Amino acid sequence: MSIPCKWLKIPFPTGTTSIPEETIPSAIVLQPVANENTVISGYKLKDTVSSPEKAQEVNNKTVSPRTPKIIVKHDNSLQSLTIMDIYSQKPIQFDESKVDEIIHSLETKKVNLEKAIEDNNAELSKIKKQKSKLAYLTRLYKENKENIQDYCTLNEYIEAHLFNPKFLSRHEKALNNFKALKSQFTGPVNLKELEKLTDKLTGIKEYSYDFHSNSLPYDLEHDKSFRNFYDFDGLKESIESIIKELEVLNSIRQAVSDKYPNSFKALNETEEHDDKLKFINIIFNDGFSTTYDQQTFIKALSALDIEKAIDAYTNVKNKLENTQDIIANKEGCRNKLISELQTLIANKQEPYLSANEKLGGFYSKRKLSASEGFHLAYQANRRDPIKPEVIENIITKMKPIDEDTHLDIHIRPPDCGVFITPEDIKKFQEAGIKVNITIHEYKQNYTRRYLQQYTHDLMRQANSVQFFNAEDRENAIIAATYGDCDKRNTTEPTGVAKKIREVGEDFDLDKYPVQKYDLKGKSGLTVASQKL
């Protein structure tokens, strides 16, 4: 059999139908995301006893910045909206009551700050130097009178006092946005409006509220006057407290490595997370039950190279050994600080995940590339929890499976009827089916090389690959041999010469990495007539 691209002609989470009708919402959003559009989708409760926890879990697993997810109740009023911003890249879920909580905290933030404004107005104006005001207001903040810390960050405290106009604008952008979001929960769910606002919450079009720390974002690059007033010492402290946690966990790993030399090998050759955890708990109970805190023990054994983590966090703390260099941006000091912090916040794997609790989520704004936006939606589709049932149905309608059942899958991203993933292919292979990928286009995606990476993902997992065009095949083979879809990023001399000719040897081109594999040995040319 075969899966056609264009020549074409279930299922849903229990209690629901899809939005749009009869789709896999995570699959059908990929063409528009591939063209850089934010697209909402999700599931609908057909009844009123209907429990949303099944759909909500599919929404959590498949949301990305370009693919916000909604649950709609039976009356077609908005039940919950899930988003993911581009800084922390975490599912964020709103029902109407959690939106109210956010509006309320933004309100008590404003009154509790106005209160401290007056309070300090007398003594504050006795201080002439801005810096002395700062050192003073910073002392007050730490003294935490009337629990002001409950309602504002130190940066918010400082700004509201010393740059009150700027602070009031910043504050209003956040509150207006969440007022706007409240509206969307009354009446019928408005799809295109939910989309344009999501862009205003995720950071694609704007970022006015840091979900991670639930506070107002301060931009180390573009908040230029505030740069000298930014809490560099706090940040530097949290990084040092993170580094301390990382040393505890790493010394737990030493203890385990000592008492159970084989188990680090064993634990790290175990595929699934749920199986890794079972083994971690067995090691804990065998010889550390009375020694360590169990939840800390688990974090330590779950972490992926704490050495590398300790290193990356130390690297940022080192940039904080000189505040004035950062204020000055001493040869990229600040560019590098911002870049490395953004990388750390966006790491959702422990130890980073738990360490980043100590840190704010936002440091400077950034544009989401088409490539990254696509890849986050693509990964969400690879995670989709209903995708397994879909593939099962196809496999059922193929049984019996001889020891020579074949499946030919036609690929022309992103415009085919079904969106195939490497997991899909693997499931077929587990069912006894060999999978051939027929590639309709490759070189033509040179302006959107994330679709070329997607194609390598499938060609790598497939049993075999056919091309209609020799230039497609040889360029793909070259990318699978040198490790990047853009020859200008490779060691290949004509590639380097092309870089130098077009952007200069040193320019920092966008990367399209491809894990190297033997494309040549598993592919060939065919002719369309053989498919017809």
Q: Which residues bind Cl ion (CB under 5 A)?
A: 443, 446, 475
Give whichever of 350 and 486 is closer to Cl ion, judged by the CB atom.
486
**Residue 369: CB minimum distance to Cl ion, A:** 18
**Residue 34: CB minimum distance to Cl ion, A:** 17
Helix (H) or strand (E) holding 373: helix 370-382
**Residue 472: CB minimum distance to Cl ion, A:** 8
**Residue 486: CB minimum distance to Cl ion, A:** 8
Give whichever of 475 and 523 is closer to Cl ion, judged by the CB atom.
475
Nearest Cα neighbor of 242 from 341, 362, 363 is 341
User: Rounded CA gap, 174 and 102, in Å?
Assistant: 10
CB 487 within 8 A of CB 495: yes
Strands annotated E in 1-118: 2-3, 16-19, 41-45, 69-72, 78-84, 91-94
CB 49 within 8 A of CB 35: no
Q: Three-state DSSP class for 19?
A: strand
CB 113 within 8 A of CB 151: yes
Give whichever of 79 and 490 is closer to Cl ion, judged by the CB atom.
490
CB 208 within 8 A of CB 217: yes
Q: Three-state DSSP class for 43?
A: strand
CB 37 within 8 A of CB 340: no
Give whichever of 334 and 487 is closer to Cl ion, judged by the CB atom.
487
**Residue 303: CB minimum distance to Cl ion, A:** 38
Give whichever of 326 and 519 is closer to Cl ion, judged by the CB atom.
519
Q: What angle do CA 262, 267, 268 make, to 5 degrees?
A: 105
How deeply is 501 buried, as exposed, middle or buried, from its count of CB atoms within 10 A (0-12, 13-18, 19+)? exposed
**Residue 475: CB minimum distance to Cl ion, A:** 4
Give whichever of 16 and 489 is closer to Cl ion, judged by the CB atom.
489
User: Rounded CA gap, 464 and 480, in Å?
Assistant: 14
CB 389 within 8 A of CB 11: yes
**Residue 370: CB minimum distance to Cl ion, A:** 16
How deeply is 47 buried, as exposed, middle or buried, from its count of CB atoms within 10 A (0-12, 13-18, 19+)? exposed
Give whichever of 446 and 507 is closer to Cl ion, judged by the CB atom.
446
Give whichever of 182 and 443 is closer to Cl ion, judged by the CB atom.
443
Give whichever of 253 and 443 is closer to Cl ion, judged by the CB atom.
443
DSSP 303: -
Here the tokens at position 414 are 């992103």
Helix axes 96-125, 154-162, angle to 10 degrees: 50
**Residue 372: CB minimum distance to Cl ion, A:** 20
**Residue 443: CB minimum distance to Cl ion, A:** 5
Max CA separation in the chain (angstroms): 88
**Residue 501: CB minimum distance to Cl ion, A:** 17
Give whichever of 82 and 489 is closer to Cl ion, judged by the CB atom.
489
